[PDB]
Amino acid sequence: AXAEAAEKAAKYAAEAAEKAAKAXA
């Protein structure tokens, strides 16, 4: 359960960062 929650958190962050990266591309 803790691992799954961490994964969800990390995926949220990765998606947010990807949006920013695309805006700078």
Ligand X SMILES: CCCCCCCCCCCCO[C@@H]1O[C@H](CO)[C@@H](O[C@H]2O[C@H](CO)[C@@H](O)[C@H](O)[C@H]2O)[C@H](O)[C@H]1O
Q: Is 9 exposed, middle or buried (0-12, 13-18, 19+ CB in 10 A)?
A: exposed
Residues binding ligand X: what is the number (CB under 6 A)? Answer: 13
What string marks each residue from 1 to 25 as x (binds ligand X by CB under 6 A) or -? -x--xx-xxxxxxxxx-x-------
How many CA within 13 A on the CB side of residue 9? 6
Question: At its nearest, how many Å lie between a second copy and the CB of residue 15?
Answer: 7
Question: At its nearest, how many Å lie between ligand X and the CB of residue 9?
Answer: 4
Question: At its nearest, how many Å lie between a second copy and the CB of residue 11?
Answer: 5
The one-character DSSP state at 25 is -
